[PDB]
Structure formats: C-alpha cells, structure tokens
Design a protein around this ligand. Structure first.
Ligand SMILES: *Cc1[nH]c(Cc2[nH]cc(CCC(=O)O)c2CC(=O)O)c(CCC(=O)O)c1CC(=O)O
Length: 290
C-alpha cells in the first residue's frame, strides 16, 4: 500500500553502505508501514537533510562533528559494535611478538602514540584508505601490520581472516564513539524519531554521550591524540576512561571517572585532564599539523 518512503542518504564505501543497510534492516523488524530507499550521495549529507532531500543518514560516531547544525539531531544510537582497536599483522604476530622495527600502519595519532608508549622499537607509518584498500596496502606495501577498528571488520564479516589481536582498552583506549553509529535526522521529524526509538540502545547512548562531552570540551577530534571510552558498569553507573598522549608516546594523561550523569562525568573528565596539561598538549599538536 501507500506508505511514507524514508530516504536514507549514504556514502558509497562498502562499509558506509553496509552500516546503512544494517540500520534499515533493523528498522524493518518493527514491521511498521514505511518504505526505505538509499540515496547514494558528513557536512554535505547534513545540508541535503536540512533541505529535505534525504530524511536520515547513518554515520560512524567517531566521525561526527561536535556540534550538529541547527535543526538536525542524533535521533538514535543503536547497540554498540565492538569498541576496540584491532591489530592485523601480515605474518600473524601479536603486538608484543612483532619483530623489532616492525612498521605499523595508521594515520591516527591516538593509535600510534599508545603503541609507542608500549614499544619504542616499532615504527608508525601513515596509511589511508577505506578498510579494504588498507588491507591491500598491508599485503602489497612495506607495512608489517595495520590498526583498524574491530567494528568495521566485523560489519563486513572480515574479522575471522584478519584480526591478529583485539586490543583491550587498557592498552589502546578507543576513539570516542568507536563502534557506535549516529543515526541523524531532522529534529522536527517526529514520525521518524518515533520509529528510531525502538532501535536506540540507552546504555550505549549514555556511554557515548559522556565520551562526546569530554571530546567537545577538550576540542578533540580525529587529528588529535585523544581517546575516550565509556561503558555501563553492572551497578548501572557510567565509567569513562579518558586519555591524551603526546605523539611520541612519552607523556600519557589517563583518568577514570564513574558517575550517573554523562554530561557531569564528561565535563569533569575534561577539567581534570586540562588541569593536568592535556589541553596545552592538544593545542601544541594542532600548531604543528597542516
Ligand atoms: C576519527 C577517525 N576516523 C577514522 C577513520 C574511521 N572512521 C570510522 C571508521 C570505522 C570504525 C567505526 O565505525 O568506528 C574508521 C576506520 C578505522 O578506524 O578502522 C580514524 C582512523 C584513522 C587511522 O587509523 O588512520 C579516526 C581517528 C582515530 O581512530 O583515532
């Protein structure tokens, strides 16, 4: 019959479309009268959305801006995927087993600084590309390993054949939002917001909100050696781990805070780390990037 057709904007990568289709398939489980169509197309997707050219988009949370444009919102955060960083070694060695001088591919200062904090006798080498391109570069270029998000590999069904070691937060604190998706829509799209409600995972959303408040107060992002991971403890409180590192791994600011209110705990984590010197570090790193 004649039902509202929800237009879902997506990037064209294998991963982007996979995450988008995942979300659509989950929403279909409610069996409500909506049709979904993907429009293959964060700031451009946002402009299209404000213009009503699309109704929603699915992004990786770790790629979301600190402030959404007025009139848009994160209308849903589904159950988190794996939050962890993953090591993918060409010849199968765990992190501690890689040979002295092993070249590990990442363009993330957060990742590389944490690895250099554990081992001096490795090299961190820039790499770019979508996940599949990076895995090919590992094979065909001078890298001994790469770091990827476990979540991306999982979404694609590639983990089994790729991951050498899942990195616990104790040794690589994840990027804020890693493994979470942001489903963005118009703030006034009440019908779509109600559809999205059943997919929202409150324990994930509250943990990520804490992470995000911390990142925004620190003026962090993907280009900065900053990390934050929140989870819900068995008693119900949120625990937030916050980290800033020097690019060379020699200086590490790392704290844990526990509380009920994600805004209060994110803000406190930020204040704590800023008093210790982590904000000055961030500002200096930004001065020495292009
Ligand atoms: C902030 C940032 N973005 C990226 C690239 C990226 N974004 C999303 C993913 C998939 C995982 C997810 O959905 O959470 C990825 C790719 C990946 O991490 O596998 C990065 C990584 C840059 C790199 O390592 O070169 C970052 C920065 C960071 O994670 O610190």
């Amino acid at each position: 019959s004649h039902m509202r057709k929800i237009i879902v904007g997506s990037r064209r990568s294998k991963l982007a479309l996979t995450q988008t289709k995942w979300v659509i398939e989950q929403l279909k489980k409610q069996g409500l009268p909506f049709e979904f169509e993907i429009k293959e197309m964060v700031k451009e997707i946002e402009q299209a959305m404000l213009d009503k050219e699309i109704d929603m988009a699915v992004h990786s949370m770790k790629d979301m801006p600190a402030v959404l444009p007025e009139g848009l919102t994160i209308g849903c955060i589904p159950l988190r995927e794996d939050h962890r960083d993953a090591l993918i070694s060409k010849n199968g060695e765990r992190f501690e087993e890689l040979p002295s001088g092993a070249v590990i591919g990442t363009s993330s200062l957060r990742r590389g600084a944490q690895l250099l904090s554990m081992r001096s006798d490795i090299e961190i080498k820039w790499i770019r590309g979508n996940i599949d391109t990076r895995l090919e570069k590992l094979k065909n270029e001078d890298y001994d390993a790469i770091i990827l998000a476990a979540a991306g590999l999982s979404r694609m069904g590639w983990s089994k054949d790729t991951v050498t070691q899942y990195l616990e937060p104790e040794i690589s604190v994840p990027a804020v939002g890693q493994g979470a998706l942001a489903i963005e829509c118009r703030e006034n799209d009440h019908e779509l917001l109600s559809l999205l409600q059943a997919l929202n995972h409150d324990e994930t959303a509250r943990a990520v909100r804490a992470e995000r408040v911390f990142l925004k107060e620190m003026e962090g992002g993907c280009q900065v050696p900053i990390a934050g991971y929140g989870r819900i403890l068995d008693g119900g409180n949120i625990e937030l781990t916050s980290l800033v590192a020097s690019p060379d791994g020699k200086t590490i600011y790392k704290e844990h805070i526990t509380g009920k209110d994600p805004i209060a705990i994110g803000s406190e984590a930020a204040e704590r780390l800023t008093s210790q010197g982590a904000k000055l570090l961030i500002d200096r790193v930004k001065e020495e990037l292009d």
